[PDB]
Amino acid sequence: VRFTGLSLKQTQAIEVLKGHISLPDVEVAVTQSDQASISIEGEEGHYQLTYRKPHQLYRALSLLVTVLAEADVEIEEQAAYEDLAYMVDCSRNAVLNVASAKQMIEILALMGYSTFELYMEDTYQIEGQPYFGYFRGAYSAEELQEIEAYAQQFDVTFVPCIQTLAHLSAFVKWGVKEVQELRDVEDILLIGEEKVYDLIDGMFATLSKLKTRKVNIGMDEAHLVGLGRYLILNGVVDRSLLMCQHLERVLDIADKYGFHCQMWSDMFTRVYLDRLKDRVTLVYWDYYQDSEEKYNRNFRNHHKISHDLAFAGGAWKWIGFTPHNHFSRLVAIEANKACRANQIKEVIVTGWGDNGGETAQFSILPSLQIWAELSYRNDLDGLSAHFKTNTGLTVEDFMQIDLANLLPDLNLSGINPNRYVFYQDILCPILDQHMTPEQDKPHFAQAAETLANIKEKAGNYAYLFETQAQLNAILSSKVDVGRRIRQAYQADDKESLQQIARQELPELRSQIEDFHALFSHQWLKENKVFGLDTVDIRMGGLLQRIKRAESRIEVYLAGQLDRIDELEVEILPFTDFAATTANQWHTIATASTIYTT
Amino acid sequence: TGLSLKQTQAIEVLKGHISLPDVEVAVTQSDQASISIEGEGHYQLTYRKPHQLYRALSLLVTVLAEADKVEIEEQAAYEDLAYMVDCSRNAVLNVASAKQMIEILALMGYSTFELYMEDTYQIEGQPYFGYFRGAYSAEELQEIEAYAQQFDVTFVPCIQTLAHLSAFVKWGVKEVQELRDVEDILLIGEEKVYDLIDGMFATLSKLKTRKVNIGMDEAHLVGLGRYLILNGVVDRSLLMCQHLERVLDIADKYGFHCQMWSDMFFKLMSADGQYDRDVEIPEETRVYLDRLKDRVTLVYWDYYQDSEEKYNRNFRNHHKISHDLAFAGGAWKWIGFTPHNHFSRLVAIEANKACRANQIKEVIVTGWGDNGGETAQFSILPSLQIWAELSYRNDLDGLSAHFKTNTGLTVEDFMQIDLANLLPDLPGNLSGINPNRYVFYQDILCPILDQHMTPEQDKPHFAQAAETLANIKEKAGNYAYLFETQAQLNAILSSKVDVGRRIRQAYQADDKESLQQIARQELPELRSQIEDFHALFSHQWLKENKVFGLDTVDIRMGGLLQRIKRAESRIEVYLAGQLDRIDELEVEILPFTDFYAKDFAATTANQWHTIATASTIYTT
């Protein structure tokens, strides 16, 4: 490959990208042109390539390397969105380690994204605030800089997303006057407390070390704001006016460092509210609605409050171990259309990691590529081709990663058997009324097999599929094991009961142990160590609870127990097709109390 | 002579504890004394109330183990003495264990046995209320009352009609969620809630007892949740009373006479939301209270004060509201695996003085089970005997002798069960200090309670405690299981208490020798000890309690063990040059809390999830 008209930065950028795409031996004249977002015209080895914004160069490289795998080229793209971002969750225990950010950045550049974002509640370090990020693998000064300089190498912008009021639970739990006197109630900060605004200066001082001056201050919906220690200290007061007062301060502080802020639309007296509108850009986030009409309605409502407005679509990796690229696809197609129709200039793909961040960071590349293709092409013609160029796997192959979520009974958001079938108890299976083993067992077994095959097309992403394979395997047996223990018990089939206890549940422990190793592997590749411990604890307990099932059945079989109380209890519906959406661990694993004091 | 079939059937069953000699007594109730025994091998025994017979037996048996001429007269200070077992923090006392408790309470002189049930009794038509919690059936409750009444002990259920219903409210189904204000609190002024509260008293109406504790403690965001969104801002002490009136009228349809915890009055009417305050009763409340104070007993609860004065000042604040007042004292069994009978003794002495000085009619001794009910149900009998002693004699002269009668152990000995909490440099007057628990559940790689350990003094204390308990185990009788559990525990705590520091110190100094030994030898020894302890703990649990709830502790230790395996693995991988640094080991450890920041390093830390991990286990 000999490209003309390129720079030194572009060349070093393209050297790293060589580790992803295989460039052909061709003459290529690269030049910046406003003509279109991306353009390529050529034949017989010589091809002229153009881009408006420099980061489009790297997607153009992916488009070229693709076409020239077959044909000897007429390509033109007119991008819909001025900005296209992906936002990694780094506050739910999964802290994306620095080597994984780079890879991420690399992939994103080839994809067409202009922006990279990290969501960091307490998970960046702040001078003179030792409890903030304490043992949570918080990013340091230099770490955030390294990551941003790397995004700079591809002309991709970095944007930290933080929280200036609520969603700081990991921080506020620490019982020291320094932390506790910053608190309103639950996860929220004490509004009006000068010490709280000291910390908010802290937040910005640290972020000002960066080159970016774009930030998401957060300021999401926190229902008890003003209602806890605020009430004791100050009496009943107008909660809308309390919120504004706070937002006014935070924005003044940002302006001190010259930050231009964004915040979640959730919060949005009126003269207070119309004044602070001008200073900020609201993000309407929606990961659920399945129609263009429902989005167009919501856009219309946010346009009544403000037109300075970005959209936050979603790549579903916040429901346990297994993402949902299939659902993501469905909502992106519909959101893009509504974003387009409503002149939305900015789109943020969010990859939250609710309840422990157990889904792999890279599991959502399809969803990312989908949004990229929607933006530049307005359709999914080049999706798989460009995707296989970018990852070395077909997008249909890659999306089978979802399988542990794809029960046939099921399109609609967040049915997550991947997680609730895995952490459910054995002796006390409270999700049992939501299994159809007639349908679920053979589905899970087939997935294991499929995923096993795909592990082998998967390259340096194989670790993802190896984990899902092992998972699905566990679920095909585990989905009804407890039900089978009940049916055996209720028929006094001690023979079968023995088989399960003596042979089946220890296998399950091995399989689960096996799962833990692969998961631990996945985690340390992708993330810092910190947070993993939560997972240790949770499967430790699952495993020990498997030992209980074994021990309780043996004492019975040995005549040392008259009944077995657990199995006597009649299982109710866990919540209100049979499946459902249960995504809190402590509540899947037991009906006992584990958080109450 | 003088006895009945009931009483003679009761004294028969008490032979399982009290070793009766070959003599002969003559029984007669009399308003003369609480108890009187007089005679020189033929004796005249009396009681004011029928249950006091059974403490008079413990007495007769004790005094006639060294002498033959006896002359006793006891004049008890409280119309009623009660013990309340927490059956809502995962440990549901099983029926055979309840029978046992009742017997002992009867010997000790207790008038009243109580079960604290947030949701741990079955209501017809609330299938989720008690679901997988081991909630008592109708049969079971009837069986426990009937047995309490075999000895003439009043049974008094303790329930919740406002807050502390987490277990119940957990369930994401419409018929439950519709009942909810915020966190663990029910929605005042919603009728589905009053429908539920109707059934609570109905389910209880099957019993002979028409005496109830309705709860209403610790509902701090009451009125500030889904209530706020539908009703807006309302005076909260008014709202509490509104709710109170509703619930008493409901109790009245079945003829119950109610008690409630007193804290919320003060919290809602104080200026910094505190319990220990003289308060300004808003006028719309005063009027409301005036009515309702005639129909409900407020129970002042306090476990923490080393002085009669401080209790006194609190009683006097309650006199603003009402003079229909009971006291609640503490048998400390809610701070992990290990009770605190020493401390319980120390504060009972003060609270007795203050209760008498405030002419208190009833004392309730309470055995809460904060955060999983891991402490053993029978671990606090000394404290029960101590309260019994301070009620009937107003001193502790009989305590050792009577306790040895009733249990087969010397109270001095039984009280060593505390040893996991009694660090030497602790002054005896501070509540809640619970290394027993947090030294156990602290992570290896990330010991976040570490600036609170003093190995120099902690390792030996645990070591010599394991030996001490071991011996006491050997003499404890049918209570050996309690001390078998405590011994193994200290065995574990002796090494666990600084293993995280040591790992850390070697790694920072590059002592690969010591990383090696710990990972290969110490840690798997630790795991093995913990596996035993778990088996010992389960034995204890399944002796005292129903199976349900044990699963929370399975989960917790299972998780501890796995965290030990990590420490093994991560170190093995470092030693082999696969990793360039154990990042865990490079975090400068901070103080966990400055609650007791004070010349000792120990502290109070009684939440499993924040002990075991600085990560989120709980939030989204």
Ligand SMILES: CC1=N[C@@H]2[C@@H](O)[C@H](O)[C@@H](CO)O[C@@H]2S1
């Ligand atoms: C703003 C938003 N705040 C919430 C996030 O904390 C969650 O991670 C996400 C997925 O549950 O849903 C909303 S989006």
Ligand SMILES: CC1=N[C@@H]2[C@@H](O)[C@H](O)[C@@H](CO)O[C@@H]2S1
């Ligand atoms: C009534 C009371 N409500 C609380 C209980 O739930 C706790 O278990 C106990 C011990 O912490 O303290 C108070 S007393």
